[PDB]
Amino acid sequence: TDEELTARFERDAIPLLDQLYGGALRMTRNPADAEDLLQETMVKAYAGFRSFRHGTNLKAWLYRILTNTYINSYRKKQRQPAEYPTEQITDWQLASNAEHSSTGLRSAEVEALEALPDTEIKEALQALPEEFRMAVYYADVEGFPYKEIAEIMDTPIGTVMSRLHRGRRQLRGLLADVAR
Amino acid sequence: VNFFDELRIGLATAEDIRQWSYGEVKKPETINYRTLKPEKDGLFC
Amino acid sequence: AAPVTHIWYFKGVPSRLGYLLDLAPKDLEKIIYFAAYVITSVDEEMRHN
Amino acid sequence: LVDRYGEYFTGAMGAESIQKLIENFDIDAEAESLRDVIRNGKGQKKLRALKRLKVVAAFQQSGNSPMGMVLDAVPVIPPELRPMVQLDGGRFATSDLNDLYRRVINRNNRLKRLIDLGAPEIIVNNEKRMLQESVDALFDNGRRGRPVTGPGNRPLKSLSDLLKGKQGRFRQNLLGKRVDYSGRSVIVVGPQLKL
RNA sequence: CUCGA
DNA sequence: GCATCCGTGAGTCGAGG
DNA sequence: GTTGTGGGAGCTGTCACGGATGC
């Protein structure tokens, strides 16, 4: 009865899990972490209890199991990476993070002005014929594929790409001194 | 439009909790330490 | 993996769970945190037979 | 009582137990049988009746099935409301929430793995109690038992902490906020001023 | 944490 | 029959590190 | 894969009050 040789584990191993707790709590410094560790150790020991020799000391086996499980926990915690809890991340921390982010904490002013039109580039675009400029739009600003540009333009691909070249040349002419 | 008429509470049934959700998180992993990218199915997935 | 009581309604004095099932809060705790079994339902006909 | 008679009744410990007790619960029956005894007599038993009736009558007239009080699925708040950042030093800071959620999710996965491994009933019962305790922490940490502590033995700010107190959501962010087009400075008497 | 009204 | 045990209140706004 | 000996930090100088609970 291999299922009976497991219930015998339920008779012997269960009692000592109390002192196993005591020890794991002395190890982890935290009650909840001690409970998590005790459960992990019990799972590890029960899964491969076939390796437990009958009639021999079982407390030391589970003790080494718990110590090794704690070592594995720390090894996995090395690359946590370094998470710390706080009741609230501070404005200092938020701004200091924005000091290295892709986009900073933006202002209502920044947003509202961004919404406004860039007169220089708007004037440089209004110069080109609205066909070649519509093409440079569908191709550069929006990034459509040239096939989709030909589709939405109702024109062949060659005309679309020729308008693209001519308009890019023109606007680089007017926007070269502007770009800088 | 800031012209609501009433605001009401009630215990949420698991049905409401799942209708709200956009997916269930499964792992304790949060972000990839190296690439600073959210681990999938984690608390930041 | 297993249901959980909303601690607001168990530990929230007066225990809403208690008043709803007419159970003493201490017994309700014994039940919820696995220090005592509770009888879900009894088959009275089979017992009588 | 299980070795014999086991086929005749059903019993168990845990939250599933309370879920069942709530299922096999006639709300109208309890409400009216409590009204009968509330008008029957008067005294401590009548006070018990009135109190235990308020909640049952709310559950009756509200259309809120008491089943809600037991949860089979927990909701997770958007990450932006429990943000994560890194400070000078490569170390990371996160909201307490994230840590409580992480404990809940870890213990839930461990309970699943135990149920699969068909482990002793006592081990799975321990895991279920730990799951209940961790969800209680996630919701109203400190309310039952010892609060969950982070480094420095700081009780983590549970989800209830976000609404309570002078520095909770209501008093600190709804009844008063920080505004733009504002400034501060030290004042000095100007006598030449008009009122 | 210390300090200002 | 109530005595305890617990759980809730306990000023505002400002500056650093 | 774990097989010789095994109970942790924490309050811990607050007060005044009202109402479940619990013997």
Question: Rounded to 5 degrees, what angle do the CA atoms D96, D99, D102 make?
Answer: 150
D167: nearest nucleotide, CA–C1' criterion:
F12
Check if A74 contacts D (Cβ < 8 Å): no
Whether C11 and D9 lie within 8 Å, measured CB to CB = no
Nearest of D27, D15, D31, D32 to residue D63 by alpha carbon: D27
The B-side interface with D (CB below 8 A) comprises 10-14, 17-18, 20-21, 25-28, 30-31, 36, 43-44
* Neighboring chain A residues of B30 at a CB cutoff of 8 Å: 83
CA-based nearest distance B13→chain D, Å = 5
Check if C24 contacts D (Cβ < 8 Å): no
Rounded to a whole number of angstroms, the CA Rg of chain B reads: 17
Nearest of A131, B11, B28 to residue D101 by alpha carbon: B28
D142: nearest nucleotide, CA–C1' criterion:
F7
Nearest of A12, A11, A42 to residue A24 by alpha carbon: A42
Instruction: Choose the mutation target among B29, B30, B33 for the interface with A, i.e. most A CBs under 10 Å.
Output: B33
Residues 6 or more apart from D154 whose CB is under 8 A from it?
A85, A87
Whether D92 and A81 lie within 8 Å, measured CB to CB = yes
Q: How far apart are CA D98 and CA D76, in angstroms?
A: 10
Q: Give the length of chain A.
A: 180
* Neighboring chain B residues of D159 at a CB cutoff of 8 Å: none
Check if A42 contacts D (Cβ < 8 Å): yes
Distances in whole angstroms, Cα of residue C48 to Cα of each of A3, A140, C45, D10: 36, 85, 5, 16
The distance (Å) linking the CA of D40 with the C1' of F1 is 22
- Cβ atoms A97, D94 nearer than 8 A: no
Residues 6 or more apart from A71 whose CB is under 8 A from it?
none
Q: How far apart are CA A34 and CA A24, in angstroms?
A: 5
The residue with tokens 């014994």 is: C30
Q: Which amino acid is at B44?
A: F
Residues 6 or more apart from A46 whose CB is under 8 A from it?
A6, A9, A13, D117, D119, D120, D123
**If you write DSSP's letter for every residue of A70-99 in order, what string do you get?**
HHHHHHHHHTS--EEEESS--HHHHHHHHT
Bridge-partner residues for C5, per DSSP? D70
Residues 6 or more apart from D99 whose CB is under 8 A from it?
A83, A85, D150, D156
Structure-solving method: X-ray
Nearest of C47, B41, D87 to residue A89 by alpha carbon: D87
| Structure letter (DSSP) for residue A50 | G
D152-168: burial string, b at 16+ Cβ within 10 Å, e else: eeebbbbbbbbeeeeee
Q: How far apart are CA A88 and CA D157, in angstroms?
A: 9
Check if D55 contacts B (Cβ < 8 Å): no
- Cβ atoms D74, B14 nearer than 8 A: no
